[PDB]
Amino acid sequence: GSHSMRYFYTAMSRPGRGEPRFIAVGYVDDTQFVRFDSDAASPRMAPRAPWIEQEGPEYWDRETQISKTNTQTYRESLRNLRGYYNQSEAGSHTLQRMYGCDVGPDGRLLRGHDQSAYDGKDYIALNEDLSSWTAADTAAQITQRKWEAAREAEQWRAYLEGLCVEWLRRYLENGKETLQRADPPKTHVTHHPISDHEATLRCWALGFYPAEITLTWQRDGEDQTQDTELVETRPAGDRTFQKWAAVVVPSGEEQRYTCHVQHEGLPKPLTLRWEP
Amino acid sequence: NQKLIANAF
Amino acid sequence: QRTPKIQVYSRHPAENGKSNFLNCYVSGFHPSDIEVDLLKNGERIEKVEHSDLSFSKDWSFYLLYYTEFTPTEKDEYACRVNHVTLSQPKIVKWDRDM
């Protein structure tokens, strides 16, 4: 189906403990494929997925040089942002950026993304038109004016419609046996007595990729949204993800409950029930 | 493939 | 500031005596500095790896800490997390059913 490339940048100041740390990670869908960390003994863009290792030295040199330039620019930005908010030099602050592109099954651009946050609060974002910005406050308006003067949006549009989509298509082909393989969830229902009166039914989904999934409990065919405990989808460490959904049911009523599972790896959506 | 980010905030 | 969510679980379904991986997934937190220990019977496991720092659409950070164990009937495993939002470290025990 559809696919995405994303880069995630985090810069963190730490007054009295050196210059701000800069970390960058790159993802295709739910698969990390590169990392950079300015605190590494020899900072350099490093592979994190087997299909990126075939890129030659020119690739790693370029990506490392971009990361080191970004490290310096983000240190400058953190100094500027401290001033825009009249903040003390004594505090630690965070600047985050996430950008990239979404493509459809035919490889055509669906849309581009470029968004930034300061201390966890949305700061400035490129609009979907890839030509204008939305600034959160009067500080972000300073950044917007600087980027408008330098025609930053036109550079981002060129990148997102060009290199971003071209390289995403390249990665998708080089990694097609994993990036273009949906692994369906392995599913089962467990039963956990609580008391004489109630038991927990827990619907499990294990070993699936990508992370996108829908797990729902129905009682007599009605969704139990408010009554379902749904844990956050979590990584297993082997590419795949795990999730479960639980409902508390009166003893003897277990067969009125059904678990419903949707995932792109499944040939058809699943309906499960407790099978004692 | 990353973008080169040269304009500070 | 946002305090971390914590899940402790195994990579593969737990079978006593059989080698596996113990995971502690911390998520939803801000700022990014966080201390995570994996514990075996209250003692810190020394060889614990972790994922590269990334974050979610709402800007909150997440990390996976993991190590090999072999689960048993009697050994107790846990994850101990400290963060600026926590007065004191939070311990979450590994429950095979969770």
Author numbering:
A (entry chain A): 1 to 276
B (entry chain C): 1 to 9
C (entry chain B): 2 to 99
Q: Which of the paper's sentences describe this entry?
A:
We tested for association of five HLA loci with disease course and identified a strong association between HLA-B*15:01 and asymptomatic infection, observed in two independent cohorts. We crystallized each peptide in a complex with HLA-B*15:01 and solved their structures at high resolution.
NQK-Q8 was previously identified as immunodominant, and these authors also demonstrated that NQK-Q8-specific T cells from HLA-B*15:01+ patients with infection were cross-reactive to the highly homologous peptide NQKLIANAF (hereafter, NQK-A8) from the seasonal coronaviruses HKU1-CoV and OC43-CoV. Both pHLA complexes exhibited the same thermal melting point (Tm), indicating that the Gln>Ala amino acid change does not affect the overall stability of the pHLA. The superposition of the two pHLA structures revealed very little difference between the two complexes, with a root mean squared deviation of 0.08 Å for the Cα atoms of the antigen-binding cleft (residues 1–180) and 0.12 Å for the peptides. Only some local rearrangement around the P8 of the peptide was observed with a shift of the Glu76 side chain to avoid steric clashes with the P8-Gln. Overall, our data show that the similar conformation and ability to stabilize the HLA-B*15:01 molecule of the two NQK peptides underpin the similar affinity observed for the public TCRs.
